[PDB]
Every structure is written in C-alpha cells, then in structure tokens.
Enzyme design. Structure first.
Site, short mmCIF file in Angstrom:
data_model
loop_
_atom_site.label_atom_id
_atom_site.label_comp_id
_atom_site.label_asym_id
_atom_site.label_seq_id
_atom_site.Cartn_x
_atom_site.Cartn_y
_atom_site.Cartn_z
N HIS A 107 -5.82 7.65 -3.27
CA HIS A 107 -6.89 6.78 -2.70
C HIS A 107 -6.39 6.00 -1.47
O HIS A 107 -7.26 5.53 -0.73
CB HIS A 107 -7.49 5.85 -3.76
N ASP A 108 -5.08 5.82 -1.28
CA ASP A 108 -4.54 5.05 -0.13
C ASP A 108 -3.56 5.92 0.70
O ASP A 108 -2.69 5.34 1.36
CB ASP A 108 -3.86 3.76 -0.58
N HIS A 139 0.85 -1.22 0.00
CA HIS A 139 0.00 0.00 0.00
C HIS A 139 0.88 1.26 0.00
O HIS A 139 0.78 2.07 0.93
CB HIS A 139 -0.99 -0.02 1.17
N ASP A 174 -8.17 -0.34 -8.50
CA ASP A 174 -7.55 -0.74 -7.20
C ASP A 174 -7.07 -2.19 -7.25
O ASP A 174 -6.02 -2.47 -6.65
CB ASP A 174 -8.53 -0.56 -6.05
N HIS A 200 1.84 1.58 -5.72
CA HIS A 200 0.40 1.22 -5.82
C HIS A 200 -0.42 2.43 -6.28
O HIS A 200 -1.24 2.28 -7.22
CB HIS A 200 -0.10 0.69 -4.48
C1 LIG Z 1 -11.69 -12.76 -0.80
C2 LIG Z 1 -12.64 -11.82 -0.08
O1 LIG Z 1 -13.82 -12.14 -0.01
N1 LIG Z 1 -12.26 -10.65 0.51
C3 LIG Z 1 -10.98 -10.03 0.53
C4 LIG Z 1 -10.82 -8.91 1.35
C5 LIG Z 1 -9.61 -8.23 1.37
C6 LIG Z 1 -8.55 -8.64 0.58
C7 LIG Z 1 -8.66 -9.75 -0.24
N2 LIG Z 1 -7.55 -10.09 -1.05
C8 LIG Z 1 -7.08 -11.36 -1.10
C9 LIG Z 1 -6.16 -11.71 -2.03
C10 LIG Z 1 -5.71 -10.74 -2.95
O2 LIG Z 1 -4.90 -11.01 -3.81
C11 LIG Z 1 -6.28 -9.39 -2.84
C12 LIG Z 1 -5.90 -8.28 -3.75
C13 LIG Z 1 -5.52 -8.37 -5.06
C14 LIG Z 1 -5.27 -7.08 -5.53
N3 LIG Z 1 -5.49 -6.22 -4.55
N4 LIG Z 1 -5.88 -6.95 -3.43
C15 LIG Z 1 -6.13 -6.35 -2.19
C16 LIG Z 1 -5.08 -6.27 -1.30
C17 LIG Z 1 -5.28 -5.64 -0.09
C18 LIG Z 1 -6.51 -5.11 0.26
C19 LIG Z 1 -7.57 -5.21 -0.64
C20 LIG Z 1 -7.37 -5.83 -1.86
F1 LIG Z 1 -8.40 -5.94 -2.74
N5 LIG Z 1 -7.16 -9.19 -1.89
C21 LIG Z 1 -9.89 -10.42 -0.28
MG LIG Z 2 -7.44 1.27 0.20
ZN LIG Z 3 -5.57 0.68 -3.02
#
Ligand SMILES: CC(=O)Nc1cccc(-n2ccc(=O)c(-c3ccnn3-c3ccccc3F)n2)c1
Ligand SMILES: [Mg+2]
Ligand SMILES: [Zn+2]
Ligand SMILES: [Cl-]
Length: 313
Positions: free
Chosen positions: A106-107, A68, A217, A72
């Site tokens: 945004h972050d 983050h 994002d 990013h």
């Molecule tokens: C699965 C569910 O239902 N909820 C969930 C919630 C938060 C995170 C992820 N998660 C898991 C695996 C990843 O590769 C990613 C991912 C891929 C690109 N960016 N993010 C990401 C990273 C940090 C914060 C939010 C993000 F969207 N995110 C899933």
């Molecule tokens: Mg964010």
């Molecule tokens: Zn972000």
C-alpha cells in the site's frame, strides 16, 4: 506443499493479537508475512516460490525512510491478518488473498512526503495523478512488480477472478489516502445508524474494506504505549523533514511539520486521536464487533497522551 512456516512459541501466540509488534529482526518479516498468508488464506493460495520472489521485490521497492518503510508494510499487513482471523466467515477467498497483498504494497516507493508536498514541489507524479497522488503511484508499483517474470502470484486464478482481485487491491490502496477516509467513515456512520448497511451490496463492501485499510494503516496508535510512543518519533521525523522542505520552497509549514514547534506535539496527538483514530476504530467496531480491541488500545493511548500534557510523563 507440506512445507509450513512455524514461528517460535511467543510469536506463534502473540501474532494472533491485534497489538503484536513484528520485532527488530528484519530477516524474520518475510516469514511472518507468509505464516499469516498460510493461516489466513491457505498453504495453496500462492505458489511459495512465486510468493517469496514477490515479497523480496516488494521489500526492495520500499525506501530507507524513518516511517513509510518495509516495517510499516508488514505491520499494516499483520493488522489486516488480525481483522480477517477475528471475522473468519465475513470475507471471500479472493478478498483475503487481495487484502494481505494490498496491505504489503500500500506504500510502495514512498519517499516520506505527503500528497500536498508533491503538489507544492510540482513533482511529476502530481501532474500524472491529480488526486490520491502517492496512492495511485503505490498501485502502479504493485502492478509493475506482479508483471515481473516469475512474480505473478495470481496466475492460477481465472481471468474474471484476476480482474476482481486487482480491483480489490486498487480500491484498498486508494482508500489509504486519508483525505478520502473522512467522507467514507461519515457515509458508513449514516448507513449503520439508519440500518441500510448491507454487506451483500458491493458498493457497501468496498466502503467497509476502505475503513479496514484506514484502521490497518493507522494501527501504530493501537499498540502498547511503549511501541506507539517510539513509533511517534519515526512518524514525526518524516513530518519535520517535510516541514524543512516546505521552508526550502519558501512556505511556512503547518505546526505538525515544524520541528521548531515540538512542544505542540502532545496536543497535536490528541486532535489526531479525536478527529481521526477514535472515530475510525469506533465505526469499525460497530460494523465488525470482534475488532473492538483496536478501539480499546486506541483509547488507552489517548489516555497516555493526556498524561504527557498533564506533565505526568
Ligand atoms: C490530524 C488530521 O486532521 N490530519 C492528519 C493528516 C496526516 C497525518 C496526520 N497524522 C498526525 C499524527 C499522527 O500520529 C499520524 C499517524 C498515526 C499513525 N499513522 N499516522 C500517519 C502518518 C503519516 C501519514 C498519515 C498518517 F495517518 N498522522 C494527521
Ligand atoms: Mg500511504
Ligand atoms: Zn501506510
Ligand atoms: Cl523522510
């Protein structure tokens, strides 16, 4: 006024593509952002002096966290650039201005921790902002920087245009709270399917801009496999640190955040692609057909993760 930014030939060409990686040379990222503003908006949208000062203050207010971070910010801004350039006539001048800035900011001041961890820690921000905790902080940080002397890049806008762009930026940043994405995409799915989607309806534009923000994002999952795979390491480095801090609060973290359960990451990536990423880019492609390459690239990466499980890598 007659000062254009020009990139080397490979970047000049590849920056137009959705799967562009901004590279490991940090000192070129401000120039990449300005280039995108000039082509997406105009050389006149912002005063170069004020914009450059705004960009460097935004950079300073991103922290040295694995994912983050400033890279990013600029990555998410480039995905929005690619969406806007492929949908030339669908967005107003104010919207193109607002959305690139919203993506860069945004972050702002992210610590690498989820809204859930802040609430369980009982962080002061969780008392100040009960929902979309970090996202309300990111908008607050954006307003604070815009109000530094010589940083108001919107100064030449009229009073009503100023209120409109700050409202576009607020909604856009709040929409990066993934908790809000599930309901936003469902509503957009219903509206597209029943034929009631109307881009002249402001409440509807807001929802479509919301989905564009989720799409930008998450855009790490729309890069070529080697970029997506290497970015996964940075994403999971933060998840595992948050998991450690949950254990320190005497809470067992969800397996996604538990560094003892690394074996389960490949299957955890399938769920995320199937529950979040694919649905996001699918609904986006339905509303904005020229964003189809994001869905194609996302599906290719889903196929790569399936291959990791089947032990083929
Ligand atoms: C699965 C569910 O239902 N909820 C969930 C919630 C938060 C995170 C992820 N998660 C898991 C695996 C990843 O590769 C990613 C991912 C891929 C690109 N960016 N993010 C990401 C990273 C940090 C914060 C939010 C993000 F969207 N995110 C899933
Ligand atoms: Mg964010
Ligand atoms: Zn972000
Ligand atoms: Cl971290």
């Amino acid at each position: 006024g007659l000062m254009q930014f020009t990139l080397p030939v490979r970047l000049c060409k590849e920056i137009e593509l959705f799967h562009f990686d901004i590279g490991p040379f940090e000192n070129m990222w401000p120039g990449i952002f300005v280039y995108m503003v000039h082509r997406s908006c105009g050389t006149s949208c912002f005063e170069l002096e004020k914009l450059c000062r705004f960009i460097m203050s935004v950079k300073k207010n991103y922290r040295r966290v694995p994912y983050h971070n400033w890279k990013h910010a600029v990555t998410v801004a480039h995905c929005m650039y690619a969406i806007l350039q492929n949908n030339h006539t669908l967005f107003t001048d104010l919207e193109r201005k607002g959305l690139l800035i919203a993506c860069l900011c945004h972050d702002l001041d992210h610590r690498g921790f989820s809204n859930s961890y802040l609430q369980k820690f009982d962080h002061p921000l969780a008392a100040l902002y009960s929902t979309s905790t970090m996202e309300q902080h990111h908008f607050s940080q954006t307003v604070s920087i815009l109000q530094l002397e010589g940083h108001n890049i919107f100064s030449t806008l009229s009073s009503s245009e100023y209120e409109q762009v700050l409202e576009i930026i607020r909604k856009a940043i709040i929409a990066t709270d993934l908790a809000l994405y599930f309901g936003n995409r469902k509503q957009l799915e219903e509206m597209y399917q029943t034929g009631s989607l109307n881009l002249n309806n402001q409440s509807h534009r807001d929802r479509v801009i919301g989905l564009m923000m989720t799409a930008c994002d998450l855009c790490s999952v729309t890069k070529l496999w080697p970029v997506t795979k290497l970015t996964a390491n940075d994403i999971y480095a933060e998840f595992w640190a948050e998991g450690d801090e949950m254990k320190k609060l005497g809470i067992q973290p969800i397996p996604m955040m538990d560094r003892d359960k690394k074996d389960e990451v490949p299957q955890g990536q399938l769920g995320f692609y199937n529950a979040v990423a694919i649905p996001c880019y699918t609904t986006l492609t339905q509303i904005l057909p020229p964003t189809e390459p994001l869905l194609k690239a996302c599906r290719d990466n889903l196929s790569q993760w399936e291959k990791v499980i089947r032990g083929e890598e």
